[PDB]
Ligand binder design. Structure first.
Ligand SMILES: CCCCCCCCCCCCCCCCCC(=O)OC[C@H](COP(=O)([O-])OCC[N+](C)(C)C)OC(=O)CCCCCCCCCCCCCCCCC
Ligand SMILES: CCCCCCCCCCCCCCCCCC(=O)OC[C@H](COP(=O)([O-])OCC[N+](C)(C)C)OC(=O)CCCCCCCCCCCCCCCCC
Ligand SMILES: CCCCCCCCCCCCCCCCCC(=O)OC[C@H](COP(=O)(O)OCCN)OC(=O)CCCCCCCCCCCCCCCCC
Ligand SMILES: NC(=O)C1=CN([C@@H]2O[C@H](COP(=O)(O)OP(=O)(O)OC[C@H]3O[C@@H](n4cnc5c(N)ncnc54)[C@H](OP(=O)(O)O)[C@@H]3O)[C@@H](O)[C@H]2O)C=CC1
Ligand code: SF4
Ligand code: SF4
Ligand code: SF4
Ligand SMILES: [Zn+2]
Lengths: 388, 158, 320, 176, 96, 115, 210
């Protein structure tokens, strides 16, 4: 304990991940102890969900990992659907994989570019948010909102893809591999970038599992684990893609894994566009999914189900489930308990960033202060989900 | 030439106002989601810098604070600390429902129901989140608000 | 009463108090505290301000949504006064300058304006009128500030006979111009200009006690028509007071600036007042009669002067 | 199925070793990074000239709220309170009574726009298309009180923006 | 149907106005009280009655799925017209 | 039954020991806190408040309830000693903005319906 | 797998395998396991006496047929009607066998629970979260202290009896030049809705009459 430096990112910089108060003991340039304090974006989300119907609670999940909006929705929908014992129709499962991979691209651009921006490489940030801006248009065209779509709902999706969307998504995907290549022309072989990431924040495979890590944090250390491949949940068993695996467990391998995941997401998006099937978009069962506005204004039964669905909500059978997905940041899971009424009894959110950040002290040992910035970045921490 | 004191004060007031609105360096609390839309306002399509609004400003050179996300009770003291350290003239822009009045955690035990309970706010930008264009409209509304200031003209008549 | 102005709630921010006050001079030292206390209990405060809207921003956090309303006014235009007090029940008046300017002299801030605000308040149906004066106000005092305070206090008592006239002494606080005066003007660039400091006795009162006293005069129905004197617990010797201030500010004290445009800091009349001796007027009621205990200088002087202090202290000696 | 992101073995011939020596000493990759940035300087900027140019939206865009009317001019809202019940943020407050002609109409309709999350559940739940989220996203205010909409404000927004709102509904009602 | 109170304040279509002695009308001083001027009650009166030739008539407000839910209205009573619960349009049975 | 797992103390004598120790740490701390946090209270007012907080929990006799009260009091101390709190948190104990609230029947009767 | 488009298909082989492993764990740790149940959507839960946490978590982590190396989550549920109102839930993941398992126990306000950090280092922050939100004390925990709530925050928000908006709210006071806490007063009270229908929805979950 040469000195304790209480580093508050209170006067936040252009990162937007949130705010982190970091309390450290610096024995010189080196870091001996790291202690994140994480109450600053705690909003009581899990308690608030208890006073909302299942439909009313869904928008809360947009606002957890607010760079993975539609992936957080899918986790909630997969959990609720499992308790309801229903199945979304095949077209919606493809739309939910398609926008699950558009969301993965959205997340990794933020992850890599803001990681590089903190380490001084500002330019790729601007290159890639012109692409995220074009992806935000896909979100707005299907849902009406650029960010918090509220589009993936239990039973399927709210509305069908507007005519002409798939062509625009294909045009975006056609030019996108070149955008990634430009990014690697500035970071992959750059000696300055490698010196800032190579052999930084090394994590062993054994310590990764015990500390609860998931996602890239495991695969960087060489663990062959991806929920989309081992516990598939929508149509992910019907799309071919490879999982990138690291060998050294450092930041640089984790950086490479994310950049390779962006390429595999474009690979998957290509298959979704070609294999998109026809049909309905939400489960054809009006005691769960609302009927069409034409039927509600014509049919007595549809008006009754419409009236009750938007007031009481559908009741979920009593039970408890733990559902997890391969979110872009890691394993995102919800432990959802139903008491049989139309409002959840308990909704515990499992955020991958909660464990990763708790593992910061382990990773920071024996590194300089400027490395901690690189370690936090490679974890991909957003404090919406860390705190909930 | 011939000129009154009233005319001189009106023209000097226009000069300082033009400089202050032409060079707005914003501090941004990126508390939550709304910080992502603040980042899109800096990206190529909108490019706030082309208005003279720098991407990143330190708290003690900043001219405007943009509160972009939920202000929790744990965070409120720090935000007021930053506000006091800002040299005047200082303006606050409240971005999004959370900062405007609590938004979708308004009934939470851990959330300040609006940042106007902590700091004075000049412009309120609605949305959850406001679109990058909606925030840009808000900043341009602050520039017009500054354009109408009459500090010197009041001082003359004191 | 009226169904709207019936007190409700528990006296907090979102509660209703039934006080609908117009506070003239709300943007000054005394105004910021009155508006703050009126807004803690959920009052409807109308804030007539002459300054820029920017200068009022500090008042906005002080109330709930809708409780603080702002208006433009000009002391010379009466119809701007009427629009400000038309819907009000109490009209508090805190208008003053420590110095003259070209446009407003002491006989316009303290006589012509307060009389106009009081007359319109009568003709507009207003019920309670709080007018602030000075303890040392005297027709025969050299300090022009205080002679204007004497006449203006005389016109209020004729225009609005049911008015509560409050006479404080020098008020001290964080943003005061009394102890901040002894710490700065005396120290930086100068050695005290004390003019026979052993001959002056001072009785200063804390700001919050004055703020509390003003509020209770609104809520207390016997205060109407009565003149008050708000004075601190202790009488001090002006020499010792300055000495005590310096000890707190850790600035060495060694016994022994022109007025200008902008804002005269130190002036001809200000000295004449800091040397006037705090009159004792026993028959006038004080803070004791409004439920306020005058607070010691010693407690609330480290608070005021911790800023001047650069980067074990003994009190002053009171005069019985 | 997995791939190795970084499991190469660098070749140890002299030709390859000299290639890395030339790279280390002559800063080859660093020059290449300078090339990419140079190429962007001569690419056209993606900036648009706001406010003269605007970003593209769609008919489904969720913006400011408004209360609509029938072609005759009667208000569509029948005070069913389905929007108030669904609102995730509890942003809507409704009171009703029988109008002088016995009609089921609201006397209070309020949206706390600082509570609202602009989710559009209320327009999904309305049976008569009375409450909609309009296309306006430029309505920032200087005071908090200006963002608490009563019935008059939302009726005025409907009168103000009906021309555009109706066309947007026409474009998307079949998807709904 | 925008009439003003004796004070000078316009009355709203819900009939609300601040009475003579209410302080809350200060909020409008220097500003304005927003009142929609198209009163729904007065506009729906103007609409003509629709003479029909059957005992039961269905109204959906027009536009098919852009109107209100479809309601069937009974016109047997002669002393009065039949009104739509949703849109307020009136119907009558022709010469019968 | 009355057979319950213990937190720390196995009877009130041990519990009252830890209570006594925790009061020592707080009594020593107030002089430091009033300085590091630059409070406007005197060290006497601070130590009276620590006495007040300890007194309000006098009646307690359950050994387990006392363990938790001590556990919580130490966590409060750890925050103040390590300066994790701020000047605002430390001064929340003194309620310096809440106006006097009466406690006699007539006073509560005049203002509102609260019992 | 049936031609019922809207009904989730049943996987019966997974149900059989999870039931076999539920017995296996019950046979091996009879001292601690109080109940084993597998749900219809295939999720095994083992209920244990609070004293078997470390033996039960250790066995699932280290056994050559368990190998639940990863703690996916750790949380508490508050059920005030139960005498032991708090139910502690452990969700574990096995990558060797591609399976998940849930371990549940219980406690009250005044009963400590053994810390699982000795078994899963992931549990360090999870238990701080449980303590902060539910006030459940974990014994032998390296560093137990609040993690989410504000400093000096009295109460435990995720208890069913803690009010939604809490008891105190913060504002800035000009007079004292700091952020002050005060008793909460809402301009608009949260409106409680009674949404439960008076008709039974799921006969399969009907409870026997008193
Ligand atoms: C007076 C000299 C004292 C010394 C000053 C300091 C050193 C000398 C520096 C002189 C400043 C020179 C730059 C002046 C800028 C003029 C504003 C401008 O660019 O016009 C565009 C602006 C454009 O308006 P805009 O800002 O609203 O544009 C909005 C954006 N668009 C248009 C794209 C939608 O024109 C103006 O609005 C005029 C602003 C007021 C200008 C007042 C300064 C003029 C000089 C007065 C001096 C008075 C001395 C007494 C006689
Ligand atoms: C070193 C060179 C660097 C490059 C050049 C730097 C820029 C120079 C050009 C800008 C000069 C602007 C000077 C005004 C400074 C800003 C004033 C302001 O913001 O208002 C605050 C104040 C407003 O006064 P105030 O008193 O109302 O503000 C305080 C308000 N209260 C009391 C509530 C706290 O403005 C001034 O103080 C102006 C000072 C005098 C300015 C010169 C006026 C001379 C002309 C009139 C006389 C004509 C007689 C015939
Ligand atoms: C600015 C314009 C940049 C041109 C575009 C980038 C470029 O052409 O450089 C690529 C070239 C090859 O570099 P590389 O890909 O690493 O493979 C070389 C194998 N040893 O890299 C080079 O050959 C550049 C070598 C430049 C010579 C060294 C710089 C000397 C500086 C003093 C003059
Ligand atoms: N504090 C003390 O030591 C004592 C004070 N008093 C009385 O207390 C009252 C206020 O105290 P303080 O707050 O210190 O005074 P300040 O000077 O601090 O504030 C006075 C207020 O009066 C307003 N004002 C001044 N001149 C005019 C004018 N010509 N037209 C309109 N408004 C004007 C100012 O508004 P702007 O800033 O917009 O000009 C300011 O808000 C004064 O009446 C003073 O006589 C009496 C005894 C002791
Ligand atoms: S206002 Fe909406 S987008 Fe902004 S921080 Fe709050 S929930 Fe997120
Ligand atoms: S958009 Fe959503 S939050 Fe806003 S008023 Fe409608 S239902 Fe409520
Ligand atoms: S706006 Fe629509 S949903 Fe809301 S009360 Fe009116 S008719 Fe019902
Ligand atoms: Zn109709």
């Amino acid at each position: 304990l040469v000195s304790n430096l209480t580093l508050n990112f209170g006067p936040q910089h252009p990162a937007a991940h949130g705010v982190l108060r970091l309390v450290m003991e610096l024995s010189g340039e080196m870091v001996r102890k790291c202690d994140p304090h994480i109450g600053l974006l705690h909003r009581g989300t899990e308690k608030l969900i208890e006073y909302k119907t299942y439909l009313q609670a869904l928008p809360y999940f947009d606002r957890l990992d607010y760079v993975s909006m539609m992936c957080n929705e899918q986790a909630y929908s997969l959990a609720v659907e499992k308790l309801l014992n229903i199945r979304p129709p095949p077209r919606a499962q493809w739309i939910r994989v398609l926008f699950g991979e558009i969301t993965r691209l959205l997340n990794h651009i933020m992850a890599v570019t803001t990681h590089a921006l903190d380490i001084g490489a500002m330019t790729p940030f601007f290159w890639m948010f012109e692409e995220r801006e074009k992806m935000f248009e896909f979100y707005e065209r299907v849902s009406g909102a650029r960010m918090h779509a509220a589009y993936v709902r239990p039973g399927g999706v709210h509305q069908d893809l507007p005519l002409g969307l798939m062509d625009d998504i294909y045009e975006f995907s056609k030019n996108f591999s070149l955008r990634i290549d430009e990014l690697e022309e500035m970071l992959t072989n750059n000696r300055i970038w490698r010196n800032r990431t190579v052999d930084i924040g090394i994590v062993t495979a054994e310590d990764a599992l015990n500390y609860g890590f998931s996602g890239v944090m495991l695969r960087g250390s060489g663990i062959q684990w991806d929920l989309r491949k081992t516990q598939p949940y929508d149509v992910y068993d019907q799309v071919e893609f490879d999982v990138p695996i690291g060998s050294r467990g450092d930041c640089y391998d984790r950086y490479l894994c994310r950049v390779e995941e962006m390429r595999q997401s474009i690979r998957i998006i290509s298959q979704c566009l070609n294999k998109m099937p026809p049909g309905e978009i939400k489960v054809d069962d009006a005691k769960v999914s609302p009927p069409k506005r034409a039927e509600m204004k014509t049919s007595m039964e549809s008006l009754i189900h419409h009236f009750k669905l938007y007031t009481e909500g559908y009741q979920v059978p009593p039970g408890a489930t733990y559902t997890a997905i391969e979110a872009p940041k890691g394993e995102f899971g919800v432990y959802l308990v139903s008491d049989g009424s139309s409002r959840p009894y308990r909704c515990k959110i499992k955020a991958p960033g909660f464990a990763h950040l708790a593992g910061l002290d382990k990773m920071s040992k024996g590194h300089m202060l400027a490395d901690v910035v690189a370690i936090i970045g490679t974890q991909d921490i957003v404090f919406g989900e860390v705190d909930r | 030439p011939s000129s009154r004191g009233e005319y001189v004060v009106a023209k000097l007031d226009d000069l300082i106002n033009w400089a202050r609105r032409s060079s707005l360096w914003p501090m941004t609390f990126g508390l939550a989601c709304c910080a992502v839309e603040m980042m899109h306002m800096a990206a190529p399509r909108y490019d706030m810098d082309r208005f003279g609004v720098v991407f990143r400003a330190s708290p003690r050179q900043s001219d405007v604070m943009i509160v972009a996300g939920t202000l929790t009770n744990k965070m409120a003291p720090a935000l007021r600390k930053v506000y006091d350290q800002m040299p005047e003239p200082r303006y606050v822009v409240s971005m999004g429902s959370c900062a405007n009045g609590g938004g979708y955690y308004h009934y939470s035990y851990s959330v300040v129901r609006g940042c106007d309970r902590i700091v004075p706010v000049d412009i309120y930008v609605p949305g959850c989140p406001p679109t990058a264009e909606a925030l840009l409209y808000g900043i341009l509304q602050l520039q017009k608000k500054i354009k109408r200031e009459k500090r010197l003209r009041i001082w003359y008549r004191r | 009463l009226h169904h709207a102005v019936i007190p409700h709630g528990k006296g907090g921010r979102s509660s209703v108090s039934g006080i609908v006050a117009t506070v003239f001079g709300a943007t000054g030292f005394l105004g910021r505290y009155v508006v703050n206390h009126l807004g803690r209990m959920g009052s409807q405060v109308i804030v007539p301000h002459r300054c820029e809207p920017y200068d009022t921003m500090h008042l906005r956090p002080m109330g709930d949504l809708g409780q603080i309303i702002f208006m433009d006014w000009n002391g010379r235009d009466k119809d701007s006064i009427r629009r400000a007090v038309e819907h009000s029940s109490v009209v508090i008046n805190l208008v003053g300058r420590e110095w003259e300017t070209q446009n407003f002299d002491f006989e316009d801030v303290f006589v012509k304006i307060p009389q106009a605000i009081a007359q319109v308040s009568k003709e507009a149906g207003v019920e309670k009128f709080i007018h602030i004066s000075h303890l040392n106000a005297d027709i025969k005092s050299s300090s022009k500030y205080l002679r204007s305070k004497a006449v203006g206090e005389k016109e209020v008592r004729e225009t609005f006979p049911e008015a509560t006239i409050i006479k404080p002494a020098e008020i001290f606080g964080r943003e005061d111009r009394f102890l901040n005066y002894f710490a700065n003007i005396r120290w930086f660039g100068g050695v005290p200009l004390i003019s026979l400091g052993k001959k002056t006795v001072k009785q200063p009162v804390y700001i919050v006690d004055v703020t509390k006293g003003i509020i209770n005069a609104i809520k207390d129905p016997d205060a109407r028509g009565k003149t008050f004197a708000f004075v601190g617990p202790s009488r001090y010797l002006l020499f010792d007071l300055v000495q005590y201030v310096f000890a707190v500010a850790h600035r060495p004290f060694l016994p022994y600036f022109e007025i200008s445009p902008f804002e005269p800091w130190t002036t001809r009349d200000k000295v004449e007042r800091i040397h006037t001796t705090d009159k004792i007027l026993p028959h006038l009621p004080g803070l004791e009669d409004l439920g306020v205990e005058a607070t010691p200088l010693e407690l609330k002087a480290i608070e005021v002067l911790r800023r001047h202090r650069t980067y074990d202290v003994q009190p002053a000696k009171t005069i019985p | 199925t997995y791939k190795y992101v970084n499991l190469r073995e660098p070749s140890m011939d002299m030709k390859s070793v000299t290639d890395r020596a030339a790279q280390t000493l002559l800063w080859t990759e660093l020059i290449r990074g300078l090339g990419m940035t140079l190429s962007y300087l001569f690419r056209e900027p993606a900036t648009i000239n706001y406010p003269f140019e605007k970003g593209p939206l769609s008919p489904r865009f969720r913006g400011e709220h408004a209360l609509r009317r029938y072609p005759s001019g009667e208000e569509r809202c029948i005070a069913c309170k389905l929007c108030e019940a669904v609102c995730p943020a509890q942003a809507i407050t409704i009171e009703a009574e029988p109008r002088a002609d016995g009609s089921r109409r609201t006397t209070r309709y309020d949206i706390d726009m600082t509570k609202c999350i602009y989710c559009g559940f209320c327009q999904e739940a309305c049976p008569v298309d009375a409450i909609v989220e309009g296309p306006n996203f430029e309505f920032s205010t200087e005071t908090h009180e200006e963002l608490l909409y009563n019935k008059e404000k939302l009726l005025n927004n409907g009168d103000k923006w009906e021309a555009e709102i109706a066309a947007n509904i026409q474009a998307d009602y079949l998807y709904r | 149907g925008v009439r003003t109170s004796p004070t000078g304040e316009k009355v709203t279509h819900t009939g609300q106005v601040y009475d003579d002695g209410d302080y809350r009308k200060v909020r409008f001083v220097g500003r304005q009280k927003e009142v929609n001027e198209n009163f729904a009650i007065d506009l729906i009166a103007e609409q003509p009655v629709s003479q029909v030739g059957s005992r039961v008539i269905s109204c959906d407000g027009g536009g098919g799925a852009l109107g209100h839910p479809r309601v069937y209205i009974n016109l047997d009573k002669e002393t009065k017209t039949g009104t739509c619960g949703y849109c307020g349009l009136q119907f009558r049975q022709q010469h019968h | 039954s009355t057979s319950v797992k213990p937190i720390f103390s196995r009877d009130m004598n041990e519990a009252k020991r830890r209570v006594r120790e925790l009061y020592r740490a707080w009594y020593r701390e107030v002089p430091n806190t009033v300085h590091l946090f630059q409070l406007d209270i005197s060290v006497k007012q601070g130590r009276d408040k620590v006495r007040e907080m300890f007194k309000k929990n006098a009646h307690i006799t359950d050994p387990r309830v006392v363990d938790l009260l001590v556990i919580k009091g130490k966590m409060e101390l750890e925050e103040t000693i390590k300066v994790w709190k701020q000047r605002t948190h430390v001064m929340r104990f003194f309620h310096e903005t809440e106006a006097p609230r009466p406690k006699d029947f007539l006073s509560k009767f005049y203002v509102g319906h609260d019992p | 797998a049936d031609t019922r488009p809207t009904v989730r298909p049943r996987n019966d082989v997974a149900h059989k395998q999870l039931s076999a492993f539920g017995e296996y764990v019950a046979e091996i740790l009879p001292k601690y396991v109080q109940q084993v149940q597998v749900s219809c959507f295939n999720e095994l839960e083992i209920c244990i006496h609070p004293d078997g946490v470390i033996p039960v978590l250790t066995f699932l982590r280290d056994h050559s047929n368990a190998q639940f190396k990863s703690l996916a989550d750790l949380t508490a549920v508050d059920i005030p009607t139960r005498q032991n109102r708090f139910e502690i839930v452990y969700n574990l993941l096995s990558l060797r066998f591609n399976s998940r398992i849930r371990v549940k126990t219980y406690t009250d306000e005044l009963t400590p629970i053994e810390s699982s950090v000795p078994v899963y280092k992931a549990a360090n922050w999870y238990e701080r979260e449980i303590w902060d939100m539910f006030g459940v004390f974990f014994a032998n925990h390296p560093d137990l202290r609040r993690i989410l709530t504000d400093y000096g925050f009295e109460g435990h928000p995720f208890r069913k009896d803690f009010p939604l908006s809490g008891y105190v709210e913060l504002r800035y006071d000009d007079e004292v030049k700091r952020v002050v806490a005060e008793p909460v007063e809402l301009a608009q009270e949260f409106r409680k809705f009674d949404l439960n229908s008076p008709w039974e929805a799921f006969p399969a979950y009907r409870q026997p009459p008193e």
